[PDB]
Ligand binder design. Sequence first.
Ligand SMILES: [Fe+3]
Ligand SMILES: [Fe+3]
Ligand SMILES: [Fe+3]
Lengths: 53, 53, 53
Amino acid sequence: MKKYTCTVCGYIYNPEDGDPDNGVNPGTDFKDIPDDWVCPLCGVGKDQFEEVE
Amino acid sequence: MKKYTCTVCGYIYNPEDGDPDNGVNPGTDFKDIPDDWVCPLCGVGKDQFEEVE
Amino acid sequence: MKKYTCTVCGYIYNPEDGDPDNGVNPGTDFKDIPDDWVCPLCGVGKDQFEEVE
Ligand SMILES: [Fe+3]
Ligand SMILES: [Fe+3]
Ligand SMILES: [Fe+3]
């Protein structure tokens, strides 16, 4: 599964790690993250993220 | 996947659209919506919804 | 699917029942519960739960 980066602040979503404190378990692909989740560091939505190719 | 209607207000849950602002992604069948979700328009629970046949 | 017990208070998570009022639908295995869920009775996190063998 691919990493995604927050293009506003640089946070990297790593699917192996998830974002458990916000209910995103390890192993969650970015597309499957609920669409109301926000960047943990900066608070922006998923639409400011981009895949890391 | 089937549409569901809120029998209190008439809102239609369309699985192709989801309810992303409340964390329900496009492609979520109604049964899989977390059971604490409420109608976005009127605030009632899932138990007031019915399948659109 | 296995039951899990809250080792702090004794609450039993039964996957057939879920915890619907907190968005955990019936049929959710414990591992798949979002990692920010807490014991409904006592408020502690998943890390204080143990499988019932
Ligand atoms: Fe960010
Ligand atoms: Fe409604
Ligand atoms: Fe407990």
